[PDB]
Amino acid sequence: TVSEANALLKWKSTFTNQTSSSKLSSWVNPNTSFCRSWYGVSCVRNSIIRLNLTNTDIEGTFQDFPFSALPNLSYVDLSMNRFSGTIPPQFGDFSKLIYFDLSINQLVGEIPSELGKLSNLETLHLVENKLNGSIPSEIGRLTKLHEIALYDNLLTGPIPSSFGNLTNLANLYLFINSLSGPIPPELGNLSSLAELCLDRNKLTGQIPSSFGKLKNVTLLNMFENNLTGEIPPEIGDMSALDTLSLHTNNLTGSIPSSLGNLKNLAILHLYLNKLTGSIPEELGDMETMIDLEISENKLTGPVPGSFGKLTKLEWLFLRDNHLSGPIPPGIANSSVLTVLQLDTNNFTGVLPETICRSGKLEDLTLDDNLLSGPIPISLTNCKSLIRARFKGNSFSGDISESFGEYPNLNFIDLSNNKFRGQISPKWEKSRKLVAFIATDNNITGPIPPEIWNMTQLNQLDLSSNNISGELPETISKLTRVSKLQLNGNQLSGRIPSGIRSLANLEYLDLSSNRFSFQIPATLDSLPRLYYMNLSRNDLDQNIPMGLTKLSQLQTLDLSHNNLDGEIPSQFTSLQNLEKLYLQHNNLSGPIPSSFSEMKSLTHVDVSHNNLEGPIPDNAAFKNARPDALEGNRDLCGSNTTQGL
Numbered sequence: 111t112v113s114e115a116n117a118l119l120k121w122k123s124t125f126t127n128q129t130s131s132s133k134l135s136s137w138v139n140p141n142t143s144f145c146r147s148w149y150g151v152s153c154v155r156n157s158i159i160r161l162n163l164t165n166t167d168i169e170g171t172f173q174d175f176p177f178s179a180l181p182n183l184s185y186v187d188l189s190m191n192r193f194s195g196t197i198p199p200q201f202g203d204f205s206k207l208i209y210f211d212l213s214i215n216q217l218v219g220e221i222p223s224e225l226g227k228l229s230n231l232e233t234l235h236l237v238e239n240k241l242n243g244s245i246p247s248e249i250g251r252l253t254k255l256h257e258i259a260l261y262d263n264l265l266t267g268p269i270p271s272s273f274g275n276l277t278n279l280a281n282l283y284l285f286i287n288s289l290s291g292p293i294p295p296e297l298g299n300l301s302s303l304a305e306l307c308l309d310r311n312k313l314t315g316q317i318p319s320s321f322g323k324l325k326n327v328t329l330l331n332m333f334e335n336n337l338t339g340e341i342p343p344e345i346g347d348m349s350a351l352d353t354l355s356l357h358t359n360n361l362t363g364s365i366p367s368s369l370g371n372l373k374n375l376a377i378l379h380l381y382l383n384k385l386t387g388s389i390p391e392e393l394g395d396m397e398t399m400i401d402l403e404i405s406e407n408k409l410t411g412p413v414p415g416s417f418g419k420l421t422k423l424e425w426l427f428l429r430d431n432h433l434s435g436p437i438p439p440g441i442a443n444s445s446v447l448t449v450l451q452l453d454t455n456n457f458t459g460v461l462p463e464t465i466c467r468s469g470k471l472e473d474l475t476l477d478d479n480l481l482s483g484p485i486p487i488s489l490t491n492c493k494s495l496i497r498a499r500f501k502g503n504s505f506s507g508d509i510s511e512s513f514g515e516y517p518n519l520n521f522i523d524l525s526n527n528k529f530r531g532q533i534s535p536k537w538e539k540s541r542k543l544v545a546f547i548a549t550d551n552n553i554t555g556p557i558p559p560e561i562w563n564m565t566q567l568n569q570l571d572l573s574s575n576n577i578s579g580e581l582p583e584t585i586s587k588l589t590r591v592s593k594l595q596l597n598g599n600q601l602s603g604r605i606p607s608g609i610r611s612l613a614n615l616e617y618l619d620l621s622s623n624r625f626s627f628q629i630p631a632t633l634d635s636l637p638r639l640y641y642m643n644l645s646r647n648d649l650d651q652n653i654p655m656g657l658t659k660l661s662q663l664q665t666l667d668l669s670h671n672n673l674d675g676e677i678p679s680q681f682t683s684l685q686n687l688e689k690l691y692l693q694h695n696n697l698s699g700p701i702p703s704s705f706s707e708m709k710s711l712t713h714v715d716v717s718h719n720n721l722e723g724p725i726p727d728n729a730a731f732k733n734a735r736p737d738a739l740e741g742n743r744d745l746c747g748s749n750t751t752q753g754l
């Protein structure tokens with residue numbers, strides 16, 4: 111004891127960057143108080159058996175640790191400190207060691223195989239260090255081990271097959287490492303195992319079929335590895351499983367139907383693999399299933415109708431597969447289903463009547479399927495909707511009757527469908543809606559004025575429709591819109607001056623419309639705008655000087671219009687302007703002597719105008735093709751279509 115206290119004092123004297131306020135100040139009077147007052151020290155029969163210095167700001171190494179002087183250590187917790195260096199082999203000399211924790215330190219080097227001498231060890235914790243090399247196989251000797259935690263290290267090599275000899279192990283945590291090679295099938299001998307976390311490693315090979323003997327494992331995390339082969343059907347024999355995660359691997363073959371035998375399985379993650387074949391209908395017998403994610407695979411065939419038996423199903427992710435056939439009604443029949451991601455598949459037919467039958471669906475994705483028909487009535491009245499994506503289908507019906515009031519709606523995408531009718535003002539009650547995208551539909555009529563009352567709208571895309579009417583000046587109320595796309599419609603009249611007020615506007619496209627008369631002269635107050643496309647309209651008169659004050663403009667397209675007069679010399683204020691399309695207009699005069707000042711100008715078309723004179727000094731005019739510069743009255747000082 112006095113020798114133990116002296117030995118620990120000499121080790122303490124090697125600590126660096128220490129403070130008088132350290133909790134080790136109590137290490138005084140070794141001859142009297144070692145077993146009564148010393149912080150972290152506890153004794154039996156006046157001999158230290160417990161050294162607990164966790165989170166005491168100790169900075170040092172174990173080189174001068176008094177191994178020989180503390181023979182009776184049974185509990186060592188030196189975690190959450192600033193210990194550096196290696197783990198000396200003499201740590202294996204503490205024959206009575208039961209608990210050993212060096213976690214959350216700055217230790218380096220390999221794990222000494224002498225730890226396999228600690229025959230009484232029940233907990234080994236070495237997490238969150240920089241330990242490298244292979245795990246010693248002699249650790250498999252420690253048959254009293256209840257828990258091994260080596261995660262968040264730099265360990266390499268295979269998991270030792272001796273680990274199968276640890277008949278009392280309950281938890282094996284080896285995640286966040288660089289372990290490699292095949293998983294030893296001897297792990298199937300770990301009959302007491304409850305948690306197997308080998309995720310985030312570089313493990314290869316097949317999942318051992320002996321895993322079917324692990325009847326007590328409730329958590330199997332092996333995701334983010336490089337496992338190959340197919341999921342062995344023996345996995346369906348791990349009856350205690352409630353979480354099975356094999357995602358982000360290179361697994362192939364079919365999903366074994368034996369997974370339906372996992373009556374306690376609540377979480378199944380199989381995504382980001384190369385699984386093929388059909389989804390077994392026996393997967394509908396996973397009665398506890400809450401979170402089923404087998405998205406991002408190559409599964410084919412139809413979704414089984416037995417999915418209606420998954421009464422606890424909350425999240426279903428089937429996106430990015432090759433599933434086909436009609437969507438069976440049981441896929442959305444769960445009363446607690448809140449996420450239903452089916453996009454990027456080959457589903458056909460119409461949506462089932464069960465989609466939002468409980469009024470709890472929040473996330474629905476159906477992008478890029480072959481679906482068609484009407485929106486089901488339970489979807490029209492699904493007030494819990496937060497995101498809904500129908501893009502890339504053949505859905506039909508009156509858009510004013512197919513969609514109700516969605517107060518919790520945040521994002522909706524109806525693009526590339528066959529919706530008809532007029533935009534209803536009901537959308538205005540989606541006070542949380544930040545994006546409304548309905549490109550490429552058969553929407554007709556005017557835009558209801560309530561749409562401009564959506565100050566929270568960030569992105570509004572009604573392009574490639576048959577919308578008509580004149581835009582009112584109340585369009586200025588969209589304070590937070592940054593992407594406005596109304597192009598490809600039959601909107602008529604003047605462009606409203608109120609677009610001035612859309613300060614956050616970055617991307618504005620009013621092209622391919624019937625806008626007439628002059629571009630608003632006041633339109634000069636869009637500091638975030640980098641793209642403006644007013645092409646293919648009926649606009650005329652001079653190009654207004656206000657456009658030259660939108661400094662951040664990168665791309666400007668005023669082509670296919672009836673603008674006249676001269677290109678202003680104030681285009682020099684568009685230093686950021688890269689693309690400038692002015693073709694098919696009635697512009698006149700000289701390209702202003704000032705275009706040299708503009709530098710980022712690479713793609714310019716000024717063809718089919720009445721301009722005359724010489725081309726100015728910058729790339730795009732040198733790099734212009736015949737079509738880019740043709741059709742003007744008097745081109746170039748030396749009448750050139752080729753260089754100078």
Ligand SMILES: *[C@@H]1O[C@H](CO[C@@H]2O[C@@H](C)[C@@H](O)[C@@H](O)[C@@H]2O)[C@@H](O[C@@H]2O[C@H](CO)[C@@H](O[C@@H]3O[C@H](CO)[C@@H](O)[C@H](O)[C@@H]3O)[C@H](O)[C@H]2NC(C)=O)[C@H](O)[C@H]1NC(C)=O
Nearest residue numbers: 195196216217218219220239240241242243244264265266
């Ligand atoms: C396991 O890791 C050790 C230690 O590596 C050290 O810590 C890591 C977390 C990384 O930050 C490494 O960059 C860092 O070095 C490896 O051993 C170490 O090898 C290096 C060079 O390979 C040794 O540096 C040498 O130091 C001498 C001076 O004594 C110089 O003359 C040399 O030119 C060279 O700079 C370093 O001393 C050594 N550290 C030890 C042995 O504790 C080890 O190779 C690695 N094992 C693996 C990856 O299998």
Ligand SMILES: *[C@@H]1O[C@H](CO)[C@@H](O[C@@H]2O[C@H](CO)[C@@H](O[C@@H]3O[C@H](CO)[C@@H](O)[C@H](O)[C@@H]3O)[C@H](O)[C@H]2NC(C)=O)[C@H](O)[C@H]1NC(C)=O
Nearest residue numbers: 597598619620621622623643644645646665666667689691
């Ligand atoms: C501004 O919006 C208009 C449309 O509103 C864009 O016009 C599009 O321009 C591209 C190329 O300039 C056209 O593609 C061309 O199609 C023809 C016919 O298929 C083909 O022969 C060409 O080789 C080229 O592929 C496209 O058809 C045209 N769209 C329409 C509806 O006319 C314009 O590009 C936009 N401006 C900017 C800067 O993006």
Ligand SMILES: *[C@@H]1O[C@H](CO[C@@H]2O[C@@H](C)[C@@H](O)[C@@H](O)[C@@H]2O)[C@@H](O[C@@H]2O[C@H](CO)[C@@H](O)[C@H](O)[C@H]2NC(C)=O)[C@H](O)[C@H]1NC(C)=O
Nearest residue numbers: 650651652671672673674675676695696697698699719720
């Ligand atoms: C293309 O433009 C020319 C230029 O005329 C414009 O006239 C003003 C209205 C103003 O815009 C100026 O910047 C231009 O000079 C048109 O030519 C004129 O045509 C009118 C007939 O309406 C005639 O009275 C004028 O004398 C013409 N002027 C010149 C200089 O020739 C031309 O008609 C326009 N072409 C098209 C297809 O629109």
Ligand SMILES: *[C@@H]1O[C@H](CO)[C@@H](O[C@@H]2O[C@H](CO)[C@@H](O)[C@H](O)[C@H]2NC(C)=O)[C@H](O)[C@H]1NC(C)=O
Nearest residue numbers: 111153154155156157158159180181182183206
């Ligand atoms: C602490 O360690 C010492 C030695 O490692 C133990 O002392 C031995 O005790 C046994 C039986 O009690 C004796 O037969 C030996 O002669 C002792 N050896 C020495 C060098 O004293 C001591 O029992 C241990 N104490 C605890 C609480 O584990």
Ligand SMILES: *[C@@H]1O[C@H](CO)[C@@H](O[C@@H]2O[C@H](CO)[C@@H](O)[C@H](O)[C@H]2NC(C)=O)[C@H](O)[C@H]1NC(C)=O
Nearest residue numbers: 150160161162163164184185186187209210211
């Ligand atoms: C060392 O001391 C710490 C804190 O004084 C102990 O941490 C406790 O550990 C148990 C589990 O063994 C937890 O249930 C407690 O909540 C923890 N408390 C705190 C404050 O962290 C730790 O167990 C001790 N270790 C040894 C070997 O004595």
Ligand SMILES: *[C@@H]1O[C@H](CO)[C@@H](O[C@@H]2O[C@H](CO)[C@@H](O)[C@H](O)[C@H]2NC(C)=O)[C@H](O)[C@H]1NC(C)=O
Nearest residue numbers: 314335336337338357358359360361382383384
């Ligand atoms: C396992 O699957 C992953 C998929 O993430 C593969 O990683 C990709 O490999 C190719 C290049 O060979 C590219 O698609 C990407 O560069 C990789 N990363 C991705 C897609 O995130 C990996 O190659 C596969 N291993 C195999 C087949 O042995």
Ligand SMILES: *[C@@H]1O[C@H](CO)[C@@H](O)[C@H](O)[C@H]1NC(C)=O
Nearest residue numbers: 124125126127128169170192
């Ligand atoms: C002590 O802390 C300083 C500041 O972080 C650091 O530069 C130094 O390496 C540490 N160790 C010693 C022995 O000074």
Ligand SMILES: *[C@@H]1O[C@H](CO)[C@@H](O)[C@H](O)[C@H]1NC(C)=O
Nearest residue numbers: 247250270271272273274275
């Ligand atoms: C596991 O223990 C048995 C006991 O005899 C031994 O024969 C076997 O070699 C051990 N496995 C490994 C991989 O060391």
Ligand SMILES: *[C@@H]1O[C@H](CO)[C@@H](O)[C@H](O)[C@H]1NC(C)=O
Nearest residue numbers: 280301302303304324325326
């Ligand atoms: C492992 O499962 C078997 C199955 O019979 C059971 O008897 C045993 O108690 C379980 N072990 C643990 C540690 O739960």
